[PDB]
Structures are given as C-alpha cells and as structure tokens.
Amino acid sequence: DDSKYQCVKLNDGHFMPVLGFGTYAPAEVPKSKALEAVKLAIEAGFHHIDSAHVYNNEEQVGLAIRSKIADGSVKREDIFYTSKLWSNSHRPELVRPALERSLKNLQLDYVDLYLIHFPVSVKPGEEVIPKDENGKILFDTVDLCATWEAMEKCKDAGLAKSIGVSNFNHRLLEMILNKPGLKYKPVCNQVECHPYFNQRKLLDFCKSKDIVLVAYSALGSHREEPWVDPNSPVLLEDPVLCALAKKHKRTPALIALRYQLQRGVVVLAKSYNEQRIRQNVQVFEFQLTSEEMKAIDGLNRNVRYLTLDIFAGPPNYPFSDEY
Numbered sequence: 001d002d003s004k005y006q007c008v009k010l011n012d013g014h015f016m017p018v019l020g021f022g023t024y025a026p027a028e029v030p031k032s033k034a035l036e037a038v039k040l041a042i043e044a045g046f047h048h049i050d051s052a053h054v055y056n057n058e059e060q061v062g063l064a065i066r067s068k069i070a071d072g073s074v075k076r077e078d079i080f081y082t083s084k085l086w087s088n089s090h091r092p093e094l095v096r097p098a099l100e101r102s103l104k105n106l107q108l109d110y111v112d113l114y115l116i117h118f119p120v121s122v123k124p125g126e127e128v129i130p131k132d133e134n135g136k137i138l139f140d141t142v143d144l145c146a147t148w149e150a151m152e153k154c155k156d157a158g159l160a161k162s163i164g165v166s167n168f169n170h171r172l173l174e175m176i177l178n179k180p181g182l183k184y185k186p187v188c189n190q191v192e193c194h195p196y197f198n199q200r201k202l203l204d205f206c207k208s209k210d211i212v213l214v215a216y217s218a219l220g221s222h223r224e225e226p227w228v229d230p231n232s233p234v235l236l237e238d239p240v241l242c243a244l245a246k247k248h249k250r251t252p253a254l255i256a257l258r259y260q261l262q263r264g265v266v267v268l269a270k271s272y273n274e275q276r277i278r279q280n281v282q283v284f285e286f287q288l289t290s291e292e293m294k295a296i297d298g299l300n301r302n303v304r305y306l307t308l309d310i311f312a313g314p315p316n317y318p319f320s321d322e323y
C-alpha cells in the first residue's frame with residue numbers, strides 16, 4: 001500500500017512524512033543528477049523532499065516533482081516539499097520575494113514548509129556570502145522576530161503551508177516563542193543530528209514545545225571541503241553501528257536512520273545512487289530494541305560536522321552556546 005506512509009502531526013495541524021530526501025550535492029556534480037535522484041527517490045517511496053535556494057537545484061528538484069505528478073506516480077498532496085530562506089533575505093521586506101523566487105524556479109504554487117535557513121544575517125543583494133575588499137563577510141543587523149512575522153505572512157498568503165527554522169539554538173527558539181503577538185510557532189527546527197551528536201538537550205526542549213526536530217547530516221554529512229574537516233571521524237565506519245548492522249543483516253546507514261525515527265526525530269537522507277536511495281527506504285522494515293537504542297545513545301561524542309564558522313561573530317551565531 002503506497003498511498004499511506006509514516007508521518008508526524010505538526011503544531012499547525014499539517015502532517016510531515018518522517019523520512020525525508022536530502023538533495024544537496026557539491027557543485028561538481030552535474031544538475032542532471034539531482035533531477036534523476038529526486039525521481040528515483042519518489043519512485044522508491046520518499047514523500048518528503050528537502051532543498052533550499054542556496055543548493056542551486058530548485059529548478060531540477062521542481063522538474064522532478066512535476067514529472068512524477070504528471071506521470072501519475074504521486075499526487076501533489078502526497079509530496080512534502082521544503083525550501084529555505086537564505087541569509088541575504090532576512091530583512092522582513094525581502095522574505096516574500098525570496099520565497100516567490102524559489103517558487104518560480106520550482107514551478108510550484110506553494111512549498112509545504114519554508115524555513116529560516118541559518119540565523120546569522122548577511123547584506124542583501126545577489127551575492128549569497130557578500131564580502132568586502134579585505135575578504136570580510138558583510139554581516140547585517142536584522143531582528144529575527146521581524147523576519148518571523150514576514151514568514152507568518154507567507155503562511156497566511158498560502159505560499160508556505162507551514163513555517164519553521166533551521167540551525168536555531170535554545171535562546172533563538174525562545175526568542176521566537178516569546179515574541180509579543182506571535183501568531184504561529186515554528187513547526188520544526190532542522191539541525192545536524194546523528195549518533196555522534198545526538199542533540200538530546202535541544203531535542204527535549206523542542207519536544208516540550210511540540211516543535212519537531214528534523215535531522216540533517218544523519219549519515220555523517222557530505223564531508224565536503226572546506227565545510228567539513230577531513231579528519232572528523234567517519235560516522236558510518238562506527239564499530240557499534242557496523243555490529244548492529246551485521247546482526248540484523250542491514251547496513252550502518254539503516255541503523256543510523258532507524259535510531260532517529262524511534263527517538264521521535266524526522267530524519268533526512270541524501271543519496272544520488274539508485275540502490276542506496278532504495279536501501280534507505282528500508283528503515284520502515286525493522287525496529288531497534290531498547291538496549292540497541294541505549295547502545296547508540298552511548299556513541300554521543302560532541303562531533304559537529306557542520307560548524308558554518310565563517311558566520312561566527314554575531315550574537316545570533318548559534319553554535320557557541322551549550323545548546
């Protein structure tokens with residue numbers, strides 16, 4: 001039965017599929033691969049697709065989605081598509097224009113979810129990481145509560161079914177939740193999460209407010225230089241994950257994805273390979289015991305692959321606080 005799939009009810013009443021397809025790939029990888037990969041993901045059973053303006057693939061991702069609706073493989077209501085607002089468009093007057101630009105590239109009428117991508121703001125313009133004459137990034141001073149109000153207007157206009165955040169810490173979440181006149185809470189906080197960085201504290205805070213944590217780099221990340229240090233440990237070579245995989249005749253990736261589902265996290269998984277795409281959907285075919293979950297909880301070791309430390313400095317940089 002393919003018209004049903006596992007989802008979670010968001011705090012605005014909409015439903016989010018619990019397994020999402022990651023679409024980012026390094027610039028070297030031709031865009032024809034993103035188009036094909038999304039088609040393969042939909043074919044395999046993924047109903048949640050994650051992208052962003054800065055991934056430079058929304059034209060291809062949108063074409064894939066539209067092709068799979070037009071060939072009868074899926075209906076628009078059974079696709080949950082996420083886009084993200086880049087940091088050069090945090091000013092409240094620029095939020096709707098950025099969403100409209102994404103929608104025009106996608107050729108879709110609405111996104112299911114629109115997120116604030118990263119909480120540090122940069123100067124507006126066509127450059128996505130604007131830099132001065134000495135190579136210094138041009139930061140901008142924006143009140144994210146004002147940005148949030150503009151996100152709420154996008155939801156009221158129907159351009160985004162749901163709105164949320166990404167890369168927010170405890171303080172930043174509280175700032176939105178305590179905003180005077182708040183209309184809509186964020187439905188989710190999309191952050192790095194895997195057995196080496198399991199986010200227990202931030203996850204519990206999100207649970208206490210009915211905010212869903214959406215895990216990125218759940219398989220150990222793309223490991224793309226300069227974003228990820230090559231000396232960071234390779235998640236999927238972990239001996240505990242590999243031993244659990246061998247016991248169950250599964251793979252370390254499947255163990256890492258199932259861990260997130262059973263702790264109440266919505267998990268993303270990027271793959272541009274036909275067999276790994278099909279493999280990843282097998283997360284719904286087995287369950288982990290409480291002892292196995294505890295063993296995986298024991299791997300926590302403070303390994304953050306994606307620091308985005310070129311944006312460090314401003315008070316909104318999210319990774320200096322404990323959580």
Ligand SMILES: NC(=O)c1ccc[n+]([C@@H]2O[C@H](COP(=O)([O-])OP(=O)(O)OC[C@H]3O[C@@H](n4cnc5c(N)ncnc54)[C@H](OP(=O)(O)O)[C@@H]3O)[C@@H](O)[C@H]2O)c1
Nearest residue numbers: 022023024050216217218219220221222253269270271272
């Ligand atoms: N909000 C943010 O700031 C943010 C940041 C990072 C990522 N994201 C989102 O999260 C997605 C996922 O994370 P990521 O892109 O960092 O990666 P990831 O999902 O952690 O994956 C890592 C790598 O795992 C490989 N892989 C996939 N399935 C596998 C399997 N079954 N067995 C072995 N290897 C497998 C992939 O290679 P192949 O493609 O060759 O299979 C991929 O290069 C991104 O694409 C993006 O949509 C968001």
Ligand SMILES: C[C@]12CC[C@H]3[C@@H](CCC4=CC(=O)CC[C@@]43C)[C@@H]1CC[C@@H]2O
Nearest residue numbers: 027054055056128129224227228306308
């Ligand atoms: C789009 C881009 C390459 C991909 C970058 C992006 C800035 C944000 C970013 C952070 C990562 O850790 C992954 C790669 C990305 C998504 C860069 C801004 C200019 C550059 O061309």
